[PDB]
Amino acid sequence: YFQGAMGSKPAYSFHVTQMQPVPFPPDALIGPGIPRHARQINTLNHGEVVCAVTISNPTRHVYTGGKGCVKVWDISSPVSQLDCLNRDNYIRSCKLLPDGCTLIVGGEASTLSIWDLPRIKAELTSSAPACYALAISPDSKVCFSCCSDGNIAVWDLHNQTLVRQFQGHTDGASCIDISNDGTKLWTGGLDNTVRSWDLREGRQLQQHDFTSQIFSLGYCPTGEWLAVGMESSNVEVLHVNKPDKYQLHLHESCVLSLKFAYCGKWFVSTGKDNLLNAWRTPYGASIFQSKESSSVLSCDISVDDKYIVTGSGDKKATVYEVIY
Amino acid sequence: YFQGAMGSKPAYSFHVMQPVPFPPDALIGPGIPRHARQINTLNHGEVVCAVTISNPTRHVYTGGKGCVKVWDISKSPVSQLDCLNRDNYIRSCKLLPDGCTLIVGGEASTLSIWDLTPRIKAELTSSAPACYALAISPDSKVCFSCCSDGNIAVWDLHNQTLVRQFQGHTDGASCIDISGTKLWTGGLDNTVRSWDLREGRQLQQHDFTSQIFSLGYCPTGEWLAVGMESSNVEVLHVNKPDKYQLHLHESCVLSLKFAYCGKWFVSTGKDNLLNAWRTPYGASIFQSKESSSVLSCDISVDDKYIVTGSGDKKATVYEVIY
Numbered sequence: 241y242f243q244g245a246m247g248s249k250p251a252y253s254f255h256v257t258q259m260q261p262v263p264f265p266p267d268a269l270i271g272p273g274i275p276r277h278a279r280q281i282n283t284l285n286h287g288e289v290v291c292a293v294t295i296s297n298p299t300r301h302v303y304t305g306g307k308g309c310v311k312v313w314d315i316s317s318p319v320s321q322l323d324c325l326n327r328d329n330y331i332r333s334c335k336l337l338p339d340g341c342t343l344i345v346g347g348e349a350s351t352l353s354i355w356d357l358p359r360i361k362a363e364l365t366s367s368a369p370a371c372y373a374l375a376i377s378p379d380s381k382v383c384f385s386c387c388s389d390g391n392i393a394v395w396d397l398h399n400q401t402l403v404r405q406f407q408g409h410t411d412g413a414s415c416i417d418i419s420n421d422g423t424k425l426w427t428g429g430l431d432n433t434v435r436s437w438d439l440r441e442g443r444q445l446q447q448h449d450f451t452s453q454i455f456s457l458g459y460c461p462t463g464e465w466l467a468v469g470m471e472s473s474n475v476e477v478l479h480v481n482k483p484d485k486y487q488l489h490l491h492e493s494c495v496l497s498l499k500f501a502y503c504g505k506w507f508v509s510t511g512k513d514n515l516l517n518a519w520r521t522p523y524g525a526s527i528f529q530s531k532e533s534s535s536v537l538s539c540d541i542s543v544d545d546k547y548i549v550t551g552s553g554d555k556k557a558t559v560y561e562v563i564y
Numbered sequence: 565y566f567q568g569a570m571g572s573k574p575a576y577s578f579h580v581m582q583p584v585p586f587p588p589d590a591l592i593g594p595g596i597p598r599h600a601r602q603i604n605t606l607n608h609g610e611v612v613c614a615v616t617i618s619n620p621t622r623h624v625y626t627g628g629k630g631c632v633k634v635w636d637i638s639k640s641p642v643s644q645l646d647c648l649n650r651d652n653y654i655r656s657c658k659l660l661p662d663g664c665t666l667i668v669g670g671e672a673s674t675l676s677i678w679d680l681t682p683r684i685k686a687e688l689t690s691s692a693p694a695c696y697a698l699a700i701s702p703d704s705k706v707c708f709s710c711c712s713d714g715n716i717a718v719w720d721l722h723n724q725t726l727v728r729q730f731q732g733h734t735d736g737a738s739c740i741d742i743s744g745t746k747l748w749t750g751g752l753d754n755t756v757r758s759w760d761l762r763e764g765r766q767l768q769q770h771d772f773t774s775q776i777f778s779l780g781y782c783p784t785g786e787w788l789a790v791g792m793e794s795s796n797v798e799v800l801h802v803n804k805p806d807k808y809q810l811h812l813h814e815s816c817v818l819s820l821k822f823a824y825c826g827k828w829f830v831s832t833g834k835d836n837l838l839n840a841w842r843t844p845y846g847a848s849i850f851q852s853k854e855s856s857s858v859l860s861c862d863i864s865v866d867d868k869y870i871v872t873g874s875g876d877k878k879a880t881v882y883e884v885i886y
């Protein structure tokens with residue numbers, strides 16, 4: 241059993257309009273659905289840099305993406321291994337379909353493997369040499385892939401056919417999220433921009449320009465907010481429509497992953513600086529911080545918000561139990 | 565400017581044991597500090613055993629070896645009060661409500677009464693070889709002194725005469741606080757005793773597993789906080805059987821002081837730590853690590869400042885930030 245203890249830090253969360261520190265409301269650090277802390281419960285010794293992590297629904301299995309393979313762990317040694325691509329190249333993203341019987345694996349290879357849960361059901365073949373990020377539509381019919389050439393590939397998962405290729409981003413598309421169904425696509429890139437896309441009419445809506453590259457992004461499940469993890473080490477929380485934005489300074493290096501909890505009240509960000517930071521939506525009050533042994537490359541939160549899994553540069557994954 | 569950031573620790577606050585589930589106003593609320601910022605260092609040069617702050621806040625009084633130093637906190641002392649002799653420590657110094665008088669107690673049979681060039685107005689002479697703690701009545705007429713022999717001497721400050729000597733403890737009386745009808749005293753006999761000030765007799769007795777070094781009575785009533793030799797802080801209800809046991813010290817809890825609003829309190833240890841706690845279940849508000857043992861503490865009447873006395877032969881002034 242653990243108990244809260246209040247700390248303070250020099251001003252790290254600012255309102256941008258020029259910067260002014262955020263005066264936190266009383267429900268910033270404590271409230272229903274607000275975690276008190278995160279407790280490490282497992283270490284998954286993958287043995288390769290873990291670039292992608294996904295948690296099963298219901299929570300039982302953890303999928304870790306390393307060099308050439310996906311390892312499946314029973315969190316109640318791997319229970320199985322999924323060989324997807326050349327054992328010299330990294331898996332960059334693996335997404336489960338809502339039901340949980342299908343897994344889509346992307347990486348440093350031209351093909352996306354669709355696994356039945358195990359064997360390869362099908363293989364979508366792209367023109368691009370690599371996939372850096374994947375997103376599945378809430379309806380489980382479409383898959384969005386962020387290509388190395390900056391394009392966004394739109395796949396029809398039923399017929400295993402390409403439907404379209406968005407304008408993307410120049411130099412590479414690094415991250416993706418779907419808008420609370422499911423008409424807007426948000427992508428980030430190495431061209432210092434975040435772009436929104438009309439999924440019904442098929443093309444670009446908005447463009448947010450930044451001073452550095454975007455490595456991660458998340459769309460708030462209760463809507464309104466988009467959280468952006470940058471090369472600069474800053475996290476920016478922008479309103480989709482309003483001009484108000486927050487700038488968060490608790491990372492000392494690149495913000496590599498970002499994930500909102502399903503209730504939308506809080507989110508996590510992970511850095512090259514060994515930190516997993518939990519933040520209050522939207523002004524970024526610091527809920528908890530966990531320091532790891534190496535760079536934290538990827539993260540996932542279970543659909544019930546009870547567990548967090550992180551992928552590490554120390555060639556492992558860590559499972560945390562979120563304590564309320 | 566500073567912003568709050570939530571942290572967690574393995575269970576350190578228990579209901580007497582079961583860990584305390586904190587309510588939402590435990591770590592955040594009006595009158596609950598966010599943090600404490602060091603603003604001054606007072607280089608006394610002797611271990612600072614007693615610290616008291618003027619009302620209104622302007623001057624801080626630090627008690628060391630045969631010397632009280634006066635500091636204007638608005639880095640060098642503005643004045644010095646030499647308590648003869650210079651070889652013994654000042655254990656307690658309490659100002660009278662107005663602020664023009666200072667009662668100095670310590671490792672000597674006499675209590676000096678200073679007029680505020682400052683001079684010694686009078687000297688109350690006790691039979692005991694030392695005074696470990698002082699408390700002044702709200703009316704400014706009586707002074708209670710905790711003697712080394714375990715007795716509680718009651719002094720009439722106007723006539724400089726002893727009125728009575730309470731049974732005290734079977735061993736030394738180390739600490740004291742006024743409820744202004746009930747006196748609470750702690751001792752080296754592992755007990756906390758309450759005294760009827762109107763009838764002049766002993767009301768209650770709380771028995772502990774180790775010696776009591778410090779104690780405080782919550783200004784809004786109900787709670788008594790006890791700092792112990794075991795390193796534990798215990799918060800006992802005056803009437804109910806419920807009690808809290810706090811474990812954030814690794815060594816003797818040497819001083820303890822409630823904020824005047826009664827919502828929070830501080831405790832200091834031989835372990836170099838200053839801890840701020842939520843009344844009554846002891847949620848950890850802030851912690852400050854010092855360079856040496858923290859022997860004494862005071863909080864200003866407005867709850868804006870904390871002063872601590874250190875084993876590193878100095879005092880530190882903190883500004884409490886809300």
Ligand SMILES: N=C(N)NCCC[C@@H]1NC(=O)[C@@H](NC(=O)[C@@H](N)Cc2ccccc2)Cc2cn(c3ccccc23)CCCC[C@@]2(C(=O)N[C@@H](Cc3c[nH]c4ccccc34)C(=O)O)CCCN2C1=O
Pocket residue numbers: 289291328329330348349369370372412413414430455494496512535537553
């Ligand atoms: N050692 C092989 N086979 N992979 C290495 C690929 C490394 C990866 N960089 C590309 O994807 C880059 N692409 C490549 O390097 C290609 N050789 C991949 C490829 C191999 C084989 C076939 C086809 C393709 C493109 C890229 C460039 N940047 C990107 C940002 C996000 C997403 C993608 C990029 C700009 C900033 C790069 C810093 C960053 C970063 O900070 N990396 C971290 C974490 C990290 C450590 N090891 C990793 C392995 C894979 C992915 C990430 C990491 C670090 O070094 O601390 C950011 C996250 C990914 N990353 C990389 O350096």
